[PDB]
């Protein structure tokens, strides 16, 4: 089942991204968590023969766009 997969990977990296709510913007620091949730994606997405990208990972994606870094400065 790849959407539970998916909500493991999702729950982990609510667990990273939840103590450094202050931190959301620095883009070097975030970029760690987010590579690891992209490349739990994908793994999952092999590991049931799915594409990569697909549409629930690219809803995740989204969704991490919407709740992290939507008001983020681009730098500084």
């Known amino acids: 089942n790849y959407e539970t997969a ?3 990977c999702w729950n982990h990296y609510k667990d990273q991204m ?3 709510e202050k931190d959301w913007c620095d883009w070097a620091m975030i970029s760690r968590p987010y ?3 992209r490349d739990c994606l994908e793994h999952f997405a092999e590991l049931f023969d799915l594409g990569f990208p697909n549409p629930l990972a690219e809803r995740i994606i989204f969704e991490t ?3 992290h ?7 500084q």
């Open 6 to 8: 998916v909500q493991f």
């Open 18 to 20: 939840d103590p450094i």
């Open 35 to 37: 590579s690891t949730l």
């Open 65 to 67: 766009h919407q709740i």
């Open 69 to 75: 870094f939507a008001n983020c400065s681009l730098v």
